Design a protein around this ligand. Structure first.
Ligand SMILES: CCCCCCCCCCCCCCCC(=O)O
Ligand SMILES: CCCCCCCCCCCCCCCC(=O)O
Lengths: 271, 271
């Protein structure tokens, strides 16, 4: 029997088809163009570091789909097709926003400090690629930890909360903000795949719980290192804050990131 | 600039999102259950060889997505996410039909003669897997030829036409038939990817046109070998034909297959 209708990832796959119909081509970015045009040069430089982090972050999950297919986990692989399609819309949405406000050509990589690179240039592609040649429990937990629990479950979740804190209130960038709420919803499913994947391996052998915690801790310094750097950039050129009577509470944001991290650790149980 | 909005595979990707919203979970198979229940044991064995061919044919296209991503073909890779998701629905639809009429447990692999295996067990996974380690023009044309032009563009297209010839007229299996029309539409896009991929490589060096033709010809004997075998099985136990005043014109079907083959060769030009 080809499919287990009761399998959690099969149920997550059904959910993905029903809830992941959004199309980035349907979003109206015209107001966003005006909003970015109305900004001052200084203000313009304010918003770009946060948007740089998202525009780099090619289907990172591809190796995972390959490895789980090879192990015969058909339901996981079905679900992963929706994940990879979500990644495609992700890239599409930011590229349309960038083109709509005229920073399509601009090289935002300058807002990737070293800590960012330690995550997005090394730990993530390395941990995913590994799975082509080594699909051990450790390897899989590591790939799920870095991508699902850290990149998505911590940084992405915190960047989405940040965009809303700043701009939903500013009245700015209604197209981006709609894109972000769709991304955020897609990502709920991604995090559940990660949790399901880590938990099933931990269930098998409690030693893998320590490995999960250890690897969340080893990545923490670069997560907080990138947040400080953005934080510092922000504080240092917050003309946008002055202009839009915004309270960019960087101390709040920072605590939101910490809370995401501890919350992810907490969704994996030793038993 | 991340995306070329004018790129053909980007336009094929936009088309895929708009036209590929079908969900196999939304199909009503209740009548199909009744229809299969109403059949005689003999009749029941009539329909299964054609359905065996489709139920085996895990994301076969995965290696292609990996290789084109590695070569920086971002638009191709976006489109391929829709392809792989279509493959997932494909597997899902047949598994739901099989479960709905009670042949979910049954081992249909017995209707795979050797010629079928030469295609679905060897040429296809071998040609796709190759791309992980060898992504030369030849390798890519070969993968596109076997999967898109032969498996989809010849066998699948001909099996869809066959199901309709037999059952749209019988009044049987309205759920399956609706599934089939969705599959057939998804496959139009798959064939266009294959054509676009083969053509772009041929454009570069006309010697690859000969290689395309040579490899279509080398696969032909197993395509026609599998068709004869089904043909022969059919002729040999056509109680379903008698019962439903069907004219299963096997000579027509056979010519339809030949026509698909020659038609695929014809969609690739030397210049
Ligand atoms: C000022 C506080 C800043 C909070 C931290 C911002 C983090 C930027 C996150 C971007 C990285 C995630 C991109 C890929 C996520 C995905 O798979 O969809
Ligand atoms: C009696 C004439 C028979 C005609 C030939 C029938 C061929 C059966 C085809 C099944 C193989 C294709 C399955 C995979 C296609 C896909 O990628 O969606």
């Amino acid at each position: 029997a080809t499919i287990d209708w009761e399998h959690p990832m099969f149920k997550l796959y059904e959910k993905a088809k029903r809830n992941g119909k959004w199309n980035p081509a349907d979003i109206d970015f015209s107001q966003d163009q005006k909003d970015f045009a109305s900004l001052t040069s200084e203000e313009k430089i304010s918003a770009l570091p946060l948007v740089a982090g998202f525009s780099a972050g090619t289907l990172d999950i591809l190796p995972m789909a390959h490895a789980l297919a090879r192990q015969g986990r058909l339901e996981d692989v079905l679900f992963l097709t929706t994940f990879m399609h979500d990644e495609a819309k992700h890239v599409e949405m930011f590229s349309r926003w960038q083109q709509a406000v005229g920073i399509g050509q601009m090289d935002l990589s300058v807002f990737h400090n070293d800590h960012y690179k330690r995550i997005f240039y090394e730990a993530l592609p390395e941990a995913m690629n590994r799975l082509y040649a080594d699909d051990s429990p450790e390897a899989v937990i590591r790939a799920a930890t870095v991508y699902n629990m850290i990149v998505e479950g911590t940084l992405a979740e915190s960047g989405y909360y940040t965009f809303r804190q700043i701009y939903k209130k500013a009245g700015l960038f209604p197209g981006l903000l709609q894109g972000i709420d769709y991304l955020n919803m897609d990502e709920g499913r991604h995090i559940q795949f990660g949790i399901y994947t880590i938990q099933r391996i931990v269930n098998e052998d409690e030693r893998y719980y320590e490995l999960f915690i250890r690897y969340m801790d080893e990545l923490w310094p670069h997560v907080i290192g990138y947040v400080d750097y953005l934080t510092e950039l922000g504080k240092r050129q917050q003309q946008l804050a002055r202009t839009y009577a915004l309270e960019i509470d960087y101390d709040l944001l920072r605590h939101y990131v910490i809370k995401q991290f501890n919350l992810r650790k907490k969704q994996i149980s030793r038993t």
